[PDB]
Amino acid sequence: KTRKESYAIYVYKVLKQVHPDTGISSKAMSIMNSFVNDVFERIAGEASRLAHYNKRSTITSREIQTAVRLLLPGELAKHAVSEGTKAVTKYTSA
Amino acid sequence: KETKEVYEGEVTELTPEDAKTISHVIVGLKSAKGTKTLRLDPTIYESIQREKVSIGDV
Amino acid sequence: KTRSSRAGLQFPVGRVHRLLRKGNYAERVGAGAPVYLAAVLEYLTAEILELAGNAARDNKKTRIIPRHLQLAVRNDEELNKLLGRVTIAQGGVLPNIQSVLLPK
Amino acid sequence: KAVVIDDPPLRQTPEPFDEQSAYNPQSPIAIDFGSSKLRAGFVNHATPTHIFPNALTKFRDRKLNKNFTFVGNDTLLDQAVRSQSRSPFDGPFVTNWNLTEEILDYTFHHLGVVPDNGIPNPILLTERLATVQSQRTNWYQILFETYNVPGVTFGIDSLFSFYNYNPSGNKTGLVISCGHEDTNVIPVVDGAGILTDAKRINWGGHQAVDYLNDLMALKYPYFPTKMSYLQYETMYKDYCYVSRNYDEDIEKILTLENLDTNDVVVEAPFTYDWRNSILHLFLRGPRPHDSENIHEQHQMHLNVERIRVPEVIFQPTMGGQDQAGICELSETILLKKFGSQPGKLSQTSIDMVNNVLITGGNAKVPGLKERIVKEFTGFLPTGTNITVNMSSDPSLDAWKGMAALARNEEQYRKTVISKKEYEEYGPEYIKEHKLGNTKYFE
Amino acid sequence: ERLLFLRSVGERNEIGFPSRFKSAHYKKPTRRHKSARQLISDENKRINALLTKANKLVPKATYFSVEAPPSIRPAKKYCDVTGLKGFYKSPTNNIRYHNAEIYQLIVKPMAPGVDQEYLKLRGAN
């Protein structure tokens, strides 16, 4: 059959990791699949325009860093830039 | 009428030599006024191994 | 040996890199940008999965209905501004009745 | 009562020049190309005659439409011409070369020299340790083409001061130089500097005053008046000392019994109890803080940094340099090298202990000699006679070094390079002598 | 008088292109600025070229050989706020601190981006 692309198992077992005794339904998997590619194209576009506004021809951590510091209203960005910097330091550590 | 001779300080070098039977061990002790090297008999080396003495232990 | 495990993250980093290559955003892509995307994505779904979890134990249900994420997303102003313009299928209306509209 | 610092005052008179009738073409010229100051003069004189920082300005006048050039002490005449001073040293090396030519022209004009077809005097030059081939190549180019000098010789300033304080040229000792931008340890055997065991730590006076600058920027982020580099230099010079034991001094310097005596309050120039909170002790000392007083928020408080910034030399991990300390590097040199078993000092090590010399520009900080004597007594075996020699002014012993070297004509000819040797061997040539750099390979 | 004294200093130290000090023949070429950042890499490439030509010879005293080995003893931890003895390191932003109240009113409410030149002093960024 067709090889459909969906991150439903990823959200399913971070749900299982943080909530070990909680269930879920297939409409929920479709609904935050719509969430995560909605924000994926939204912030992929944002950085794109921005970098092009900056006249840079690439996408490193800097453009997306200012995009996620600028885009969403608050709080989640304050934890998000810290946890993303911590993620790229465990990447460069490895 | 007895005497008391005491060496105390931080271990900086614990180098034993054999010939499975250890012959002796050169032990270096360091305090705030300098350092002093010591040769030791293997029985005191066995007692040192009993006390779990490594490099840097006073 | 996977790069997501090397980054210590759970959301995949090769999948978003694949979607970034042929997604026609930039002709050159850095290494840390898909990791940063996966990090902010993991943070966003971690936050609303905590919200859906406390809504689920507020209603005392083992399965998160989308209505649970409606009153999870309408209980904070940050996602009331981030997802205020959005329209949700089978979302309902949060309980909100004006004091003047109530009798007596 | 708080003290107020300023810029150093400008010189009322300009720098005089020597008489041209006293010049002779047989006397050599001694120069010391230091990172902070320039020392120029003859050899027969022992006292200095020209000391000035290496700087130059291009003052464009509106009425005459002519770019005037002010060099060194001539830059210390007006505040605007002091602020536009430009050093030729970029990093630990030199990069712009024409500035070196015009400051050398200024020194030659102010030395009272009337030459013809270039300077007829051989020159005596100090150079940094492990100096890069490009700057010595350009040095050979400028002296052998621009100035037509007959001879040249080179060496390290630390070894030159060591030879100054050991004029026999055959002694064994351990020299330590704390320069403006680097700190060097050279073990010297039989009057010859063993440079394969030399060690360098990337810290000096410039990094220390930059540490003061960004430490004061970080401690008081809401300070309104930007204070200049000279204020940082002066309050580093006047209010800093080496602690005798940094582990024990740091656990009691925040108590109220020390902050009444060991806190310096520096006033900027312009036209729920606080006793139990160490923030108020760290920021505003043992006196209560009033935010409405105009003179109050123009104040530094130097309580921890006075013993913190000289400890970067002893522990470079504070300054971000992943290097061993001065005491640990000296332990490595003295206890495990030159045939010295750890725990059994060789005679080379014993001779190196009795001739420990501290020199350089950054030895002016008090408490350094007592601290290094305490560390040396700490790690050496008991009974070793430790001798540390410190000059009254260790910023001038290099000029005494080339003065004693060129006065000693017997060993002066072993280090000189003429025009003929350079012309037959090119710029790529290494003169292997005792008091200078060695070959890059074996 | 104030604006005329610097003219006297300039005309006293006035020198020109055909000065009496530099030599008669010049042959002065152009010169690139050649900042000190690329100089260490230039010497590294040069010494690598020399060792690779020798490989197709042990160095004695270079810039990269005199330079100090790192410390064998562990470095003492210190609080980045006060320069005191550091006991605790915050897990959110990785700054060592000495006691509770600097964690309360300095380490917690600090602005983002202050961390990078906070840790620049010890080079932990």
Domains of chain A with CATH codes? 1-93 (1.10.20.10)
Q: Is C68 part of a structural domain of the chain?
A: yes
CA distance to partner chain D, nearest, from residue B27 (Å) = 10
B47 at the D interface (CB within 8 A)?
no
Task: State which approach was used to obtain the coordinates.
Answer: cryo-EM
Q: Is C95 part of a structural domain of the chain?
A: no
CA distance to partner chain B, nearest, from residue D378 (Å) = 5
Query: Is D163 exposed, middle or buried (CB count within 10 Å of its CB: 0-12, 13-18, 19+)?
Result: buried
CA distance D79 to D286: 36
CA distance D234 to D243: 19
CA distance C3 to E14: 68
Q: Is C31 part of a structural domain of the chain?
A: yes
Q: Is C104 part of a structural domain of the chain?
A: no
Terminal alpha carbon distance of chain C? 69
CA distance D375 to B30: 12
Cited resolution, angstroms: 3.3
Q: Is C94 part of a structural domain of the chain?
A: no
User: How many distinct helices (H) and strands (E) make up chain A?
Assistant: 4, 0
CATH number of the domain where residue C45 is located: 1.10.20.10
Nearest CA among D396, D407, D398, D395 for reference residue D43: D407
Nearest CA among A36, E18, D9, D327 for reference residue C15: A36
| Count of structural domains within chain C | 1
DSSP assigned state of D320: T
The structure tokens listed for D282 are 């760290």
The structure tokens listed for E97 are 């601190």
Q: Is C43 helix (H, G, I), strand (E, B) or coil?
A: helix
Which contacts qualify for D288-296: CB closer than 8 Å, 24 or more apart?
D295/D2, D295/D267
Instruction: Write out chain E residues lying below 8 Å of D95, CB-based.
Output: 33-36
DSSP assigned state of D294: T
Number of other CB atoms surrounding residue D13 within 10 Å:
7
Q: Which of residues 83-102 of E touch A (CB under 8 A)?
A: 92-93
Q: Is C102 part of a structural domain of the chain?
A: no
- Kindly give the residue spans of alpha helices, DSSP state H, lying in D196-238: 205-219, 229-238
How many angstroms from the chain centroid is the CA of residue D152?
Answer: 23
Number of other CB atoms surrounding residue D164 within 10 Å:
21
Please, are residues E96 and E124 in contact by the beta-carbon 8 Å criterion?
Answer: no
Strands (DSSP E) along D214-315, which ranges? Answer: 264-267, 299-302
How many angstroms from the chain centroid is the CA of residue B2?
Answer: 23
Phi, psi dihedral angles at D40 (to 5 degrees) = -135, 145
Q: Is C83 part of a structural domain of the chain?
A: yes
- Contact state of E37 with D319 under an 8 Å Cβ cutoff: no
CA distance A81 to A93: 18
CA distance to partner chain E, nearest, from residue D385 (Å) = 26
A21 at the C interface (CB within 8 A)?
yes
With a CB cutoff of 8 Å and minimum separation 6, the contacts of D69 are: D56, D57, D58, D59, D102, E10, E13, E15
The structure tokens listed for C71 are 């009153």
With a CB cutoff of 8 Å and minimum separation 6, the contacts of D138 are: D97
Query: Is B42 exposed, middle or buried (CB count within 10 Å of its CB: 0-12, 13-18, 19+)?
Result: middle
Nearest CA among D79, D171, D110 for reference residue D356: D171
Say if strands E88-89 and E96-97 run parallel, antiparallel, or are unpaired.
Answer: antiparallel
Among chain C residues, the shortest Cα distance to A87 is held by C7
Q: Is C103 part of a structural domain of the chain?
A: no
Query: Is E96 exposed, middle or buried (CB count within 10 Å of its CB: 0-12, 13-18, 19+)?
Result: buried
